[PDB]
Amino acid sequence: NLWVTVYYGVPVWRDAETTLFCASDAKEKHNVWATHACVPTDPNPQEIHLDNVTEKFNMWKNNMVEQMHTDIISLWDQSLKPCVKLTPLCVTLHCTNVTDREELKNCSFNMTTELRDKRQKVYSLFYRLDIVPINENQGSEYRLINCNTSACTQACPKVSFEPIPIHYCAPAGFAILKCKDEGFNGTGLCKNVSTVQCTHGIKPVVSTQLLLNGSLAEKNITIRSENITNNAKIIIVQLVQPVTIKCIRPNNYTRKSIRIGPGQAFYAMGDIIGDIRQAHCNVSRSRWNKTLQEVAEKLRTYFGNKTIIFANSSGGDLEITTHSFNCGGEFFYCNTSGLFNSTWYVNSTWNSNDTITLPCRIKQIINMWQRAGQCMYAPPIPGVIKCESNITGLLLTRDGGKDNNVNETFRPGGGDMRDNWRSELYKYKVVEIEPLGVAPTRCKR
Amino acid sequence: NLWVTVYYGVPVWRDAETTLFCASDAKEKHNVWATHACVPTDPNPQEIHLDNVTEKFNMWKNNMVEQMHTDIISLWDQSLKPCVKLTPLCVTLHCTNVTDREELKNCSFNMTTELRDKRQKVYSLFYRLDIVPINENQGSEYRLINCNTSACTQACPKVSFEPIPIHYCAPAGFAILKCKDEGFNGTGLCKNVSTVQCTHGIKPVVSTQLLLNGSLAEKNITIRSENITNNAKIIIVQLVQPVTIKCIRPNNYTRKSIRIGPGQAFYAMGDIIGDIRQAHCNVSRSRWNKTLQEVAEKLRTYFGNKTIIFANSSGGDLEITTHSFNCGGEFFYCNTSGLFNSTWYVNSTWNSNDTITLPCRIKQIINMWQRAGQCMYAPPIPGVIKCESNITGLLLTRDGGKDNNVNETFRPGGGDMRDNWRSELYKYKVVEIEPLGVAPTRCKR
Amino acid sequence: RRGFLGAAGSTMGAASITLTVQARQLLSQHLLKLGVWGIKQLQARVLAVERYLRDQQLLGIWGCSGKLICCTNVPWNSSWSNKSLDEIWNNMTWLQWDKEIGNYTQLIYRLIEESQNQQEKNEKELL
Amino acid sequence: RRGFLGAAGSTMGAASITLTVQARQLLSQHLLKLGVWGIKQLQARVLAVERYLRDQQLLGIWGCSGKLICCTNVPWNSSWSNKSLDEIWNNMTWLQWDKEIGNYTQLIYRLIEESQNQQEKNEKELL
Amino acid sequence: RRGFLGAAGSTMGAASITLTVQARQLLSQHLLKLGVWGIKQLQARVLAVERYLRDQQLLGIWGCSGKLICCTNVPWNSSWSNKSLDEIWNNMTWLQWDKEIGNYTQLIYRLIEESQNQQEKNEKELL
């Protein structure tokens, strides 16, 4: 006859949720991500290829993207907790035009000091986007935008916002399955699976309408969407050739520190050296059109012989209507209207520098996670700053038209902040290993 | 001969103390008890009856009552930690009579705003109990009572004080013994023992002089006291018939929100609508004084043929001299003198609605745990509010007289806040199971 | 079939037939808020593991791990208990017997360790 | 010699040769900051111990602790699976077999405890 | 009878008789304040369990769980040490020997694992 036997360490698994811990090449200056407290990554991470194995993946229903979003938000608040709170900055501001070019305002206002029985009158420039008029009259009066909803916390100047890579690892008794299928769209049964105890270097780069410093497609421009035919679902596309983008802040400000209270100070831009210059970003036109034509023809496969037409983003908040990013200290907000402005036919071929220019705006008071209140004041970085990024992905949205026309418009939509993480975690999934297995055999012989 | 043998998983236990965790039917709106972070309770909790077992119980020396008291206090402070602190409210208040009926006062006072360089003058009603004059004369310059001891923290309006049930569970390797003896007084050897991993639904209903929404007696009015003859020990009695009690707040207040500072506001009773009406509670006289006869005769068994007399609270603080409770947002303070006012002689027999009316007072500033400082401000609930409760227990105290007379007087004593929990946890006790056991046998045969 | 701890009142002989049910219940949201309830839950889980390990490690050194019932080489000293072998396995219960050997429980544990350790060295370690 | 979890696609018969690598990886700065990363790491470490103990305690009560493979006294009921021995051990993989016994997994676990406990009582406890 | 770790200086042959005392001390207020001292105590308690399990799990896979001394099927290699069987057991101490096999400690562990699994595979699994 046969007897039931139990096998320990059987190679089986199931989908499960767990608390993933961080791992990093620790090496020092601190960062907003607090990677100094993270576990040190191994020098030679182990990766194994599963033969004869095919596993199902679902990047939209993945739990890693949701868990990482909470961790990033938690780390963001943790770094701002010990910094000074700009509670006395909520006062009437008297501004005048600086000595378009009206982006700045030379404001003056009263302020306290270490001595409680004494006050001081100071002055400092302020971007127009960070100021709101009071009474809608008497142009001199002005108020900080966040003042009537929350008191923003000044970021500590000692910590930098460098997005160094961080590896997400699973606890003992769990594993992360990686799909190595060529040109995998992120959903379906993967024909080339592999396992790894920790994900590759994930850089928590925050961007809208354009993924920067992200992964690159191996051989072909990949497109991902839970429902391509649905106009209410964001469309993520990954490029094969990185499109280098240059940015600069020609304004040369002077950092001035004023002590608002005992043992604390507020940083602001004192004056400006030279004439006022608008901030912008550059990108090669030849290497940009090309990407589109390739993206346009690729999108054509999912909509018949229809012509693709990219148009500038729809109206709304500045965070969603412009390409937001950060050059390691300053939050930028560029137009992008110059990149998604063209029409491609079923034969349209793109066929010198001629670099495109994107005007940009800069703000100090920001809401990175779109939460009510909980704002942060970004101190000004002294001197001119420049930063180059690698554009590897785009966030597109299809207009909700009747679809019966001979074309279709695509708008660069900001989507959700979680989409940025989903573009990199699509090649992973966490599973729980059940080493206890049962099977029969003619034992007891 | 005989050899010693060890048995694993032996059914033995001993008294111990452990950190009990919360379990609840989790399902959303938040609450002061923070049940959202509690473990979800099982749908079919396992309960087993022990045959041939008789265990000793002592609800007075129990550890769960003390442990639960700390947890309730800790949860109360945790819920109030992120709420706004009413530190600027400590200012001189000029009040006048509202346009007995002098329970309210239309006060006015200066206050700050989001703009640190500007101030505002506001007005709002205030109960006379939460107001104390600064000087005997001037008939003005009133001050909030708690102002000279601590700054009260305004309760977050998004969280409610619903006393939803919570189940106390023991960790693995421990169990909670339940006594199922009929009419058990809480002390002695239980002749009907049972075991359960988690206690029944315990509702943290804070009350004084009258247990509300508590468990009902199984078959007879049970009385509990560590020393019935001692005059300094509180006496707890459990009823069999739930005496329904209704309460109402006929004052239609108008909530008005004033921004005290950046991103924070103070919500105060704004203006009354209609006319001033005294808050009160109702209770059936036939059903109320009928139970007194049953309670009086039951108490007679412990003091011979002496007659029982009920008198009103001796005197003292408002929290101990009145029946305190909360109708899901407003804390009431009702005078019970209309209930504990009667004399019962051995033959006395109680033999239409005729509902009794209990005048009540309302306060915004309160110290739930009688702790110095750490006060709390309850925001006003808009509109009229009503709430019905089930009176199932009473906290009585016997006068410290010579007791040589032919009668005895009982007073509704507030006792201690822990008595409220002890009235429901008397049917449980935590024990530590020791799976290791030793016993001999003629082994090695 | 009684549930967990349902045979506590039964005699010593009949209460040992269900040791598996009591031994199984010795260890029975992924995120943690670390709040009032979270802190208590974390302590409860850690305390539970220590209670099991503290009791399981003894069986390992005693040479009875993975076995519910086992016999050692330590002879039974009549001084600990002079009661017959019939009433103990057919009339007495575990609770009553627990309050009779508690005084000598610590000494019995040490005798079993030295007996098992000495036997291990005598049998194994040929040279 | 395949790495950790490398024999998942291999047949059931060939997968039993590398059980040691999977069983070894079940539990593989001294200070703790108790921060965002520290809190998660603490939960991960505690969760890993519970996962191993929860799975290891079953082998202890079943009498298979310290053994990678063991045979129980419970006969194989044809109702659970009527497939032959050759196809399951030489053609089917563990993943496919997992989706066939799952329904009867809980029942099989309960039957093994009573089968081992009864035999344990019958063998030992001479009187 | 020397106390805990009292036979460290004694020779190998004389130090193997008291292994039980060192093995017993490997795991030896209910509330927790989570303060400076509470945080350290929590880490210490968790670290102790991991240290014991990390060392105990190796014996389980090796097939030596529940035993203090056990002989494996891996033959000794003279390359690791060419000393005689008399000086090591009657003259050298454990500390001096620890600084001689450390270079081959990891290699010996892997050899024992595959050797135990193969023997398990060969003996059990009748078909």
Ligand SMILES: *[C@@H]1O[C@H](CO)[C@@H](O[C@@H]2O[C@H](CO)[C@@H](O[C@@H]3O[C@H](CO[C@H]4O[C@H](CO)[C@@H](O)[C@H](O)[C@@H]4O)[C@@H](O)[C@H](O[C@H]4O[C@H](CO)[C@@H](O)[C@H](O)[C@@H]4O[C@H]4O[C@H](CO)[C@@H](O)[C@H](O)[C@@H]4O)[C@@H]3O)[C@H](O)[C@H]2NC(C)=O)[C@H](O)[C@H]1NC(C)=O
């Ligand atoms: C840091 O903090 C300091 C100290 O608080 C602060 O200084 C004060 O600033 C305020 C705001 O600018 C000044 O207010 C002005 O003061 C003068 C003087 O008022 C005195 O004299 C008049 C005339 O006798 C009296 O009525 C009065 O009681 C005082 O004694 C006035 O000229 C100003 O009134 C005009 O402006 C007001 C605001 O718009 C109007 O409401 C008012 O109607 C007046 O309007 C003006 O323009 C009209 C045409 O549109 C014209 O018809 C009017 O006649 C008039 O010209 C105003 O009240 C105040 O004086 C400052 N000094 C002191 C000691 O308080 C700093 O400003 C602050 N700094 C910063 C950077 O925030």
Ligand SMILES: *[C@@H]1O[C@H](CO)[C@@H](O[C@@H]2O[C@H](CO)[C@@H](O[C@@H]3O[C@H](CO[C@H]4O[C@H](CO)[C@@H](O)[C@H](O)[C@@H]4O)[C@@H](O)[C@H](O[C@H]4O[C@H](CO)[C@@H](O)[C@H](O)[C@@H]4O)[C@@H]3O)[C@H](O)[C@H]2NC(C)=O)[C@H](O)[C@H]1NC(C)=O
């Ligand atoms: C996409 O990826 C690219 C490549 O990593 C990023 O580009 C870099 O961005 C960082 C900021 O995020 C730049 O960092 C800054 O560079 C300044 C210039 O560096 C040169 O000159 C200094 C001497 O002046 C040399 O030491 C250095 O090796 C270079 O030759 C530095 O002056 C800055 O210093 C400040 O930050 C550091 C780090 O915290 C502090 O230690 C300093 O004290 C000081 O505060 C800073 O290092 C970097 O130069 C950029 N590289 C390039 C090639 O441009 C993109 O930012 C990234 N895009 C996004 C959106 O993430």
Ligand SMILES: *[C@@H]1O[C@H](CO)[C@@H](O[C@@H]2O[C@H](CO)[C@@H](O[C@@H]3O[C@H](CO[C@H]4O[C@H](CO)[C@@H](O)[C@H](O)[C@@H]4O)[C@@H](O)[C@H](O[C@H]4O[C@H](CO)[C@@H](O)[C@H](O)[C@@H]4O)[C@@H]3O)[C@H](O)[C@H]2NC(C)=O)[C@H](O)[C@H]1NC(C)=O
């Ligand atoms: C002893 O036990 C009794 C029985 O549980 C308690 O009585 C209840 O007390 C709660 C407050 O603690 C009462 O709750 C409130 O009821 C209002 C009326 O409810 C009726 O009408 C609404 C629509 O208007 C229906 O949805 C509902 O089903 C009923 O038909 C609600 O309007 C109140 O809602 C507001 O407050 C809650 C809590 O903050 C919010 O979640 C809501 O969004 C809203 O803002 C509220 O639900 C309840 O009605 C009482 N029941 C009875 C039968 O009277 C006693 O309070 C309890 N005693 C003690 C001392 O604990």
Ligand SMILES: *[C@@H]1O[C@H](CO)[C@@H](O[C@@H]2O[C@H](CO)[C@@H](O[C@@H]3O[C@H](CO[C@H]4O[C@H](CO[C@H]5O[C@H](CO)[C@@H](O)[C@H](O)[C@@H]5O)[C@@H](O)[C@H](O)[C@@H]4O)[C@@H](O)[C@H](O)[C@@H]3O)[C@H](O)[C@H]2NC(C)=O)[C@H](O)[C@H]1NC(C)=O
């Ligand atoms: C925003 O708006 C503020 C004003 O609201 C601007 O700040 C002022 O800017 C002006 C113009 O730059 C500053 O005044 C200038 O200072 C130059 C430097 O002066 C040098 O010589 C001085 C000689 O000393 C004597 O004279 C001075 C001036 O009367 C007295 O203060 C002394 O006591 C002596 O009597 C030195 O003191 C000084 O340190 C220099 O060495 C000067 O060349 C110019 O002619 C002019 O006077 C003014 O001081 C600024 N105020 C403050 C508080 O900073 C600000 O720049 C605006 N920002 C922008 C970007 O537009």
Ligand SMILES: *[C@@H]1O[C@H](CO)[C@@H](O[C@@H]2O[C@H](CO)[C@@H](O[C@@H]3O[C@H](CO[C@H]4O[C@H](CO[C@H]5O[C@H](CO)[C@@H](O)[C@H](O)[C@@H]5O)[C@@H](O)[C@H](O)[C@@H]4O)[C@@H](O)[C@H](O)[C@@H]3O)[C@H](O)[C@H]2NC(C)=O)[C@H](O)[C@H]1NC(C)=O
């Ligand atoms: C506590 O004490 C405070 C005062 O210290 C009480 O508050 C005041 O209560 C009175 C009486 O209710 C309020 O005055 C009333 O306002 C009514 C408004 O109705 C409409 O007509 C108005 C007419 O406008 C002209 O006149 C008003 C002043 O009368 C000017 O402000 C306007 O600019 C115009 O010139 C409109 O303003 C208004 O928008 C309506 O359309 C009015 O009908 C009544 O005759 C009376 O005047 C008074 O405003 C309250 N003050 C505040 C700051 O709220 C409070 O009620 C007391 N509480 C209790 C419980 O007694």
Ligand SMILES: *[C@@H]1O[C@H](CO)[C@@H](O[C@@H]2O[C@H](CO)[C@@H](O)[C@H](O)[C@H]2NC(C)=O)[C@H](O)[C@H]1NC(C)=O
């Ligand atoms: C599964 O994906 C892996 C990814 O590495 C493929 O690996 C091959 O690796 C060899 C050795 O480095 C390269 O020469 C090949 O070019 C890789 N192949 C490809 C397609 O990139 C592996 O071949 C893939 N397997 C299948 C069946 O597609």
Ligand SMILES: *[C@@H]1O[C@H](CO)[C@@H](O[C@@H]2O[C@H](CO)[C@@H](O)[C@H](O)[C@H]2NC(C)=O)[C@H](O)[C@H]1NC(C)=O
């Ligand atoms: C991603 O690729 C998978 C296949 O790998 C696509 O899944 C197919 O979707 C079509 C839609 O008509 C179905 O008919 C097929 O049965 C699906 N196949 C499988 C294997 O699931 C999926 O639609 C692709 N997604 C996108 C956005 O292109």
Ligand SMILES: *[C@@H]1O[C@H](CO)[C@@H](O[C@@H]2O[C@H](CO)[C@@H](O)[C@H](O)[C@H]2NC(C)=O)[C@H](O)[C@H]1NC(C)=O
């Ligand atoms: C994906 O989206 C398509 C539409 O793009 C859905 O198919 C139909 O969509 C129309 C509107 O265009 C709706 O009125 C229909 O109800 C949809 N059909 C159904 C059956 O619901 C489609 O359902 C979406 N989902 C999938 C899985 O394809």
Ligand SMILES: *[C@@H]1O[C@H](CO)[C@@H](O[C@@H]2O[C@H](CO)[C@@H](O)[C@H](O)[C@H]2NC(C)=O)[C@H](O)[C@H]1NC(C)=O
């Ligand atoms: C997207 O492009 C359109 C192009 O027309 C912008 O629309 C306007 O352009 C005309 C001419 O310059 C102005 O007079 C209007 O004021 C613009 N406003 C609108 C909303 O029509 C449009 O603003 C662009 N959108 C963004 C977000 O850049």
Ligand SMILES: *[C@@H]1O[C@H](CO)[C@@H](O[C@@H]2O[C@H](CO)[C@@H](O)[C@H](O)[C@H]2NC(C)=O)[C@H](O)[C@H]1NC(C)=O
């Ligand atoms: C995309 O196709 C639509 C539909 O043909 C174009 O819009 C129509 O263009 C005709 C041109 O004569 C107008 O008469 C219609 O009123 C337009 N709208 C509709 C609803 O039919 C649209 O212009 C095309 N876009 C491009 C630039 O190719």
Ligand SMILES: *[C@@H]1O[C@H](CO)[C@@H](O[C@@H]2O[C@H](CO)[C@@H](O)[C@H](O)[C@H]2NC(C)=O)[C@H](O)[C@H]1NC(C)=O
């Ligand atoms: C609760 O009931 C127990 C009995 O179940 C009472 O116990 C007796 O109390 C008297 C007090 O003089 C003692 O003389 C008896 O020996 C006690 N009997 C037992 C079995 O303990 C206990 O007093 C009751 N408590 C109250 C106050 O009602």
Ligand SMILES: *[C@@H]1O[C@H](CO)[C@@H](O[C@@H]2O[C@H](CO)[C@@H](O)[C@H](O)[C@H]2NC(C)=O)[C@H](O)[C@H]1NC(C)=O
């Ligand atoms: C319980 O209370 C009674 C009194 O109600 C205690 O008994 C004695 O009471 C008289 C006064 O009536 C005191 O003078 C005695 O001192 C009390 N006895 C003792 C020994 O102090 C009784 O002792 C209390 N406790 C118990 C367990 O019954």
Ligand SMILES: *[C@@H]1O[C@H](CO)[C@@H](O)[C@H](O)[C@H]1NC(C)=O
């Ligand atoms: C890019 O596209 C435009 C049309 O949008 C076309 O005129 C141009 O020739 C293309 N190529 C370059 C190099 O600009």
Ligand SMILES: *[C@@H]1O[C@H](CO)[C@@H](O)[C@H](O)[C@H]1NC(C)=O
């Ligand atoms: C972006 O550029 C377009 C022109 O290409 C202009 O109409 C629009 O107003 C600009 N807006 C922003 C956000 O810069």
Ligand SMILES: *[C@@H]1O[C@H](CO)[C@@H](O)[C@H](O)[C@H]1NC(C)=O
């Ligand atoms: C103990 O309970 C069992 C089970 O009901 C019963 O058979 C036995 O007679 C009881 N013994 C005593 C002494 O009550």
Ligand SMILES: *[C@@H]1O[C@H](CO)[C@@H](O)[C@H](O)[C@H]1NC(C)=O
């Ligand atoms: C309570 O009410 C009675 C009348 O019912 C009254 O005589 C007594 O003074 C009141 N005392 C209070 C407020 O406790």
